[PDB]
Design goal:
Peroxisome proliferator-activated receptor gamma (chain B); about 260 residues; homodimer; DNA-binding transcription factor binding (chain B); DNA binding (chain B); 4 strands; activator (chain B); Retinoid X Receptor; 4-stranded mixed sheet
């Protein structure tokens, strides 16, 4: 009702999401960007040999190197699913949805979120790994034998364009919640309440971007456009994962069913 | 130029140009669909036969060739409209070509929704109505060309856009700076920025009760890009499952590496 209260409620939502995102995601964009500047410093993996030396220096929790890198990547993606699941609980309204729809939203949303947040850890020349302790170069990843060489590259191509928007963690918190609350996922039972929540999240995102990036014309539309493009990257990624299944034990297989 | 009066002037210009370029508008289609000479209904083989009388030798392929033809006329109308968008004809000529090549299909499906309800689609300048169920009953792979368009249209049509809204949306689609092989990206994104500002103002003034309509409309890009990807896929199937299919050179050029 009273003047300014609509704006205040949207700011309070934005703050709530930010505080939750901090809680759920230990290596924030702010922390990663400071590391990427390069003054401490992560171990740099820039070829096969330094990879072998890097496995001495960083204890990895997870036979052909392209395949070991891929398996590492899989371990990390499983960890990230658990972080994103915990974050999703803090999005107002999520835990009160039909339990099956909660499962569906996360099933189809986590990949989009993984690649969004991976851009926070990337520059045009490589990616922070193992909690910011390692940095693997884009050139080394590109050098891996087909089809592994082409796995990581499109993610770098997306990241450089996405990072050009210069979002901060306060922006990304809201953007990731908008992705999760997508009413268009297959097999959703109750679409309307999901769209209702996403509507309030979009309002909060729009106000956040208008206040944080006033000189960035139509940043809100531009961000929704990236949302559109993440869908592309994911479908292409899933296309690639299938190729592997066919062209390239059981308890491991189960942890990684996806 | 981004003061309110400039944005309304741009809105009104595009609407005028849209009415000049596209003879069958949503307004005209909706008047036809709702009873104002009722269109001839094609719902089975016997009614198709009479309709071909009263409005290849094989049905599915005849339906295909008639649809290609309408696609060519659509491309022609969209090109006339694109030329009217301020700034378009001033761009590098190769980029004008690229924008049309990649933009026409997205616009084709957007505007097709104007001709659709959940039961069917207006054909032959609004003189025929071909049912969704008939289209779904066509032999492989033809029974699958139209169904994703119907799904999209039902949802898109729930946004309740009118011709004045669509004229700006379609311009936004054409001026997309992410098309493959654009040489001069910034001039295109500058124009699109101004079209987005105009679109935002238009929806806020034309649909003041419709919460986040701007965002919900831009989210329909996801549906549109996916429709076009599916359509390219279905053309690849046709290449495998069919004999000679005569293909108009305009369509051949657009499909070339698409």
């Amino acid at each position: 009702g009273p003047l300014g209260s609509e704006s205040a409620d949207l700011r309070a939502l934005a703050k709530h999401l930010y505080d939750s995102y901090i809680k759920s995601f230990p290596l924030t964009k702010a922390k990663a960007r400071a590391i990427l500047t390069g003054k401490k410093s992560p171990f740099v993996i820039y070829d096969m040999n330094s990879l072998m030396m890097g496995e001495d220096k960083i204890k990895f929790k997870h036979k052909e190197v392209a395949i070991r890198i891929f398996q590492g990547c899989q371990f990390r993606s499983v960890e990230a699913v658990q972080e994103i699941t915990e974050y999703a609980k803090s999005i107002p309204g999520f835990v009160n949805l039909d339990l099956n729809d909660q499962v569906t939203l996360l099933k189809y949303g986590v990949h989009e979120i993984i690649y969004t947040m991976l851009a926070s850890l990337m520059n045009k020349d490589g990616v922070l790994i193992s909690e910011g302790q390692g940095f693997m170069t884009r050139e080394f990843l590109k050098s891996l034998r087909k089809p592994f060489g082409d796995f990581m590259e499109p993610k770098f191509e997306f990241a450089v364009k996405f990072n050009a928007l210069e979002l901060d963690d306060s922006d990304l918190a809201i953007f990731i919640a908008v992705i999760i609350l997508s009413g268009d996922r297959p097999g959703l039972l109750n679409v309307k309440p999901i769209e209702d929540i996403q509507d309030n999240l979009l309002q909060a995102l729009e106000l956040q971007l208008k206040l944080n990036h006033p000189e960035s014309s139509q940043l809100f539309a531009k961000l929704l456009q990236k949302m559109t493009d993440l869908r592309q990257i994911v479908t292409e990624h899933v296309q690639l994962l299938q190729v592997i299944k066919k062209t390239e034990h059981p308890l491991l297989q189960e942890i990684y069913k996806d």
